[PDB]
Design a protein around this ligand. Structure first.
Ligand SMILES: Cc1cc2nc3c(=O)[nH]c(=O)nc-3n(C[C@H](O)[C@H](O)[C@H](O)COP(=O)(O)OP(=O)(O)OC[C@H]3O[C@@H](n4cnc5c(N)ncnc54)[C@H](O)[C@@H]3O)c2cc1C
Ligand SMILES: Cc1cc2nc3c(=O)[nH]c(=O)nc-3n(C[C@H](O)[C@H](O)[C@H](O)COP(=O)(O)OP(=O)(O)OC[C@H]3O[C@@H](n4cnc5c(N)ncnc54)[C@H](O)[C@@H]3O)c2cc1C
Ligand SMILES: *SCCNC(=O)CCNC(=O)[C@H](O)C(C)(C)COP(=O)(O)OP(=O)(O)OC[C@H]1O[C@@H](n2cnc3c(N)ncnc32)[C@H](O)[C@@H]1OP(=O)(O)O
Ligand SMILES: *SCCNC(=O)CCNC(=O)[C@H](O)C(C)(C)COP(=O)(O)OP(=O)(O)OC[C@H]1O[C@@H](n2cnc3c(N)ncnc32)[C@H](O)[C@@H]1OP(=O)(O)O
Ligand SMILES: [Cl-]
Ligand SMILES: [Cl-]
Ligand SMILES: [Cl-]
Ligand SMILES: [Cl-]
Ligand SMILES: [Cl-]
Ligand SMILES: [Cl-]
Ligand SMILES: [Mg+2]
Ligand SMILES: [Mg+2]
Lengths: 437, 437
């Protein structure tokens, strides 16, 4: 079938590539509104920090190389501006020539993702971070203006990674956030290490703070403070790239996302949606879920490739919401329903803080593991871990437990790999099970 | 019930402690034939390497402290020499006075573990490692003789840990092993990094080599080589501490171990056996299993505590055999049936070698993950991972998957915690799943 894909990055280029692995005959075309396809979204903060300096790690292909390798046509600077689903075409604006045209399709795959929100100030020193064009602009601005002081707005994982990277590059960032609710995917009382790491390095921060006015490099704040900054990076959330979908028959929810079934199909025949734009449900509980992360973009890309050109019996089984972020020496990871979703259940919480490995063994650091479970059936609802070591290991094990409908009590049965450098004979995970009841 | 425990370490002291958590009225007494209770068995190689300096780290309790905190009586230098099972008493030899006496019991818990084997040479420079007395003797001998060249016999994981520690302490070890099957719980081809690490540090080793004769410090080998050594640490296997059990009604297998049911009961009423002395079965396949490691001693300790003083519906579900060892920069971990047991199944092998984390993120290294599955039902039979980073995480996740007899195909559904420093959007575990078709 003739396949058209909208968006040429985590979900889109991946999906197109997976289809080509299975189907060598179909024509596949991807439209991407911006300059680059296949940029490494998750590498961007590290490119800014000069941790990742080889351009080949910043993006995988150019349209020419993608065509040579996979016979997939990718048109960059081409923005889809409407989906004419009844005639099975999309309307595309060639941004280089400013002319539009219709492209027909047998199957349409939507992976437009999200755009960064902006505070809306008229400021030449302010930047958001979403793609490689943004990354290049930020790097160039730092060099052209000999940037030293940078204001980082927002406290989600993107902003935190950007702050760490600016610091490692040798700049002097200050972090502000409109409330005290930083790194929201993690339990609010488990984020203190973020503030401790800032303090330890004397990196200034102010919570319940916002930009009030900008006059050149003079920034006036809500708190009444006035400071001079060379650059501002705003990480104040994202919004779905779905305005171009509104006039079509595709069903969107009130927040602008696309609900899909387990085959990643929209309500319209032959049109699929994957990636950040799509909403589905949790795997372990009967609740809606939206998890705008890379694992989901890649998993959905594979499922849609099977639906179109492979085993169409392969279907999604829902999200668990596994997520993680590094901030200086600490790791913050969680899986399951969000803190705000726990109230939909009668639940109990159990937790343990213990060394990541043998207490007598060097380089140890306390790991805090917390697990929430449903009192009606003892099923695990959510888990969170924070520590300098071993949090990723504990959360991935709990993600596998939740996939298998394990009860909190059965965690005493988990057989950990034990030697002094790695865990304890009764691992933190086993202790959660023993402490449950 | 009056409870008598034989052995005051990983299984025994733990079990007595777990019973006390549930029952504050029963009298509990533990007999330990040697000097110390609750020594840190797994810390011993590190104590020899001076990685663990504070000897307080190698001993968790003394009998006086155990009585003060848990009201449990522990008699060290007291060796149980016979079990008079029909009258429900044990005969105990007070090793300080050489006088024996009987101790009655309502429940008897055997956790005598295993003793180190010896090659049998008449040599004052040869030592074995099993407890803190041994560790003290080795340390004392190194200092008294200014030991430099040391022969480490045996290539099992503990001997390897001893070798690494002797090297880091500043001594010059040479490793020999009677066969080429080093670190036997790991796939043979995946153990090459052990030899690479030895070679990188110019630490000599000879496989399929054995001691022929010992004449003072002059050691003659099977190969015909003659070398002078200041000390020899023999890691030539262990044997069960069951000679004192032979006269009783307890059933022992041909190797001297005690087969137990899922309540860790022996064939004799009121007598339980846990730890290295006990044999059971695998959880995921119908085959016998013996896994003489710490996790099993602690898990059995809790199950026996529930049987005696808690919820008697709690029973063991079998072993998976999760194990791991660190050797210099590498980690070697495996779970499931042993290499030699794979022949009892019709199976296939799938493997991937990929970066432990994002390829562009610093300090990456190649992680080799291998999974064996049963062709009759797609169930995972065994998994092994070797690498400088991430092997423990992948093997613990697979242990959790096996606990639930998960299939190899379902690994595509595992939702990993992804950020650049930790994994990939399609993790190594997911890739095993994608490569299994
Ligand atoms: C700085 C940063 C760090 C991140 N870190 C992590 C992390 O560590 N771990 C993690 O799991 N996730 C991380 N993410 C999230 C991850 O990048 C997204 O979940 C993933 O990119 C979503 O894939 P997608 O295809 O939906 O969107 P994207 O990969 O963003 O691709 C969307 C594409 O479609 C294009 N598009 C939109 N509308 C149109 C249109 N009308 N016509 C043509 N093209 C269009 C856009 O220009 C864009 O190139 C990070 C994201 C960023 C920006
Ligand atoms: C150097 C070393 C390193 C190790 N490293 C690891 C590792 O990294 N990971 C891992 O999982 N496992 C490791 N182990 C294995 C682990 O220590 C054992 O699996 C665990 O100790 C078994 O518990 P147990 O109670 O059966 O035996 P033990 O803990 O050995 O205790 C047995 C006790 O009973 C006593 N006893 C025996 N007979 C009698 C008697 N007749 N009367 C009175 N007392 C008696 C013995 O003196 C001994 O103190 C290691 C062991 C050693 C020695
Ligand atoms: S923010 C974190 C996520 N970031 C991104 O996704 C960045 C944008 N990504 C993309 O644009 C696409 O993901 C690109 C880079 C275009 C390619 O996507 P694929 O996932 O399909 O990758 P490749 O085609 O490059 O495959 C490379 C290696 O993986 C093996 N492989 C892919 N798919 C499969 C399946 N289904 N089964 C088995 N193996 C599979 C390939 O064989 C290949 O290994 P090599 O070592 O290259 O031979
Ligand atoms: S080679 C590796 C194996 N070697 C060894 O284990 C060495 C010898 N071991 C022992 O002698 C025992 O394992 C000792 C050191 C006596 C410990 O026995 P327990 O396992 O029973 O532990 P503690 O009573 O000392 O408890 C320490 C902490 O764990 C919590 N805990 C234990 N058991 C439970 C159960 N069933 N449920 C909830 N919590 C449990 C304790 O409350 C305690 O926590 P703290 O806040 O640190 O007091
Ligand atoms: Cl990336
Ligand atoms: Cl239309
Ligand atoms: Cl705790
Ligand atoms: Cl220990
Ligand atoms: Cl008798
Ligand atoms: Cl039996
Ligand atoms: Mg129309
Ligand atoms: Mg504590």
């Amino acid at each position: 079938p003739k396949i058209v894909v909208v968006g040429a990055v985590a979900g889109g280029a991946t999906c197109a590539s997976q289809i080509r692995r299975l189907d060598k005959e179909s024509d596949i075309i991807i439209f991407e509104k911006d300059r680059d396809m296949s940029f490494a979204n998750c590498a961007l903060p590290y490119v800014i920090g000069e941790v990742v300096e080889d351009r080949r790690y910043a993006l995988a292909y150019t349209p020419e190389k993608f065509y040579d390798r996979k016979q997939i046509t990718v048109k960059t600077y081409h923005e889809v501006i409407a989906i004419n689903d009844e005639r099975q075409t999309v309307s595309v604006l060639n941004r280089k020539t400013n002319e539009q045209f219709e492209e027909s399709y047998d199957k349409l795959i939507l992976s437009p993702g999200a755009s960064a929100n902006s505070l809306g100030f008229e400021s030449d020193i302010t930047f958001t971070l979403r793609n490689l064009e943004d990354t290049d602009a930020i790097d160039q601005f730092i060099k052209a203006n000999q940037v030293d002081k940078v204001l980082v707005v927002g406290a989600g994982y993107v902003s935190l990674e950007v702050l760490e990277n600016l610091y490692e590059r040798g700049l002097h960032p200050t972090l502000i956030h409109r409330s005290d609710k930083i790194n929201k995917l993690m339990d609010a009382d488990m984020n203190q290490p973020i503030l401790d790491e800032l303090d330890k390095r004397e990196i200034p921060y102010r919570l319940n703070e916002e930009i009030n006015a900008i006059n050149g490099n003079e920034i006036t704040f809500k708190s009444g403070k006035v400071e001079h900054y060379d650059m501002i990076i705003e990480g104040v959330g994202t919004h779905p790239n779905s305005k171009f979908i509104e006039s079509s028959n595709i069903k969107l929810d009130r927040k602008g996302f696309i609900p899909v079934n387990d085959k990643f199909e929209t309500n319209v025949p032959n049109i699929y949606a994957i990636g950040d734009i799509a909403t589905s449900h949790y795997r372990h509980v009967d609740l809606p879920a939206s998890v705008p992360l890379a694992w989901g973009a890649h998993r959905a890309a594979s499922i849609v490739a099977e639906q179109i050109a492979g085993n169409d019996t392969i279907e999604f089984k829902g999200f668990l919401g596994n997520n993680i972020v590094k901030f200086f020496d600490y790791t913050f990871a969680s899986v399951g329903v969000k803190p705000n979703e726990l109230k939909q259940f009668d639940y109990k919480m159990v937790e343990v803080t213990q060394g990541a490995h043998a207490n007598y063994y060097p380089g140890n650091s306390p790991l805090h593991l917390r697990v929430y479970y449903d009192t009606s059936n003892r099923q695990i609802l959510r888990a969170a871990a924070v520590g300098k070591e071993g949090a990723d290991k504990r959360i991935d094990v709990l993600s596998m437990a939740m996939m298998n409908q394990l009860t909190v009590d059965e965690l005493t049965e988990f057989e950990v790999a034990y030697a002094p450098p790695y865990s304890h004979p009764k691992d933190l995970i086993n202790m959660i099970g023993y402490k449950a009841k």
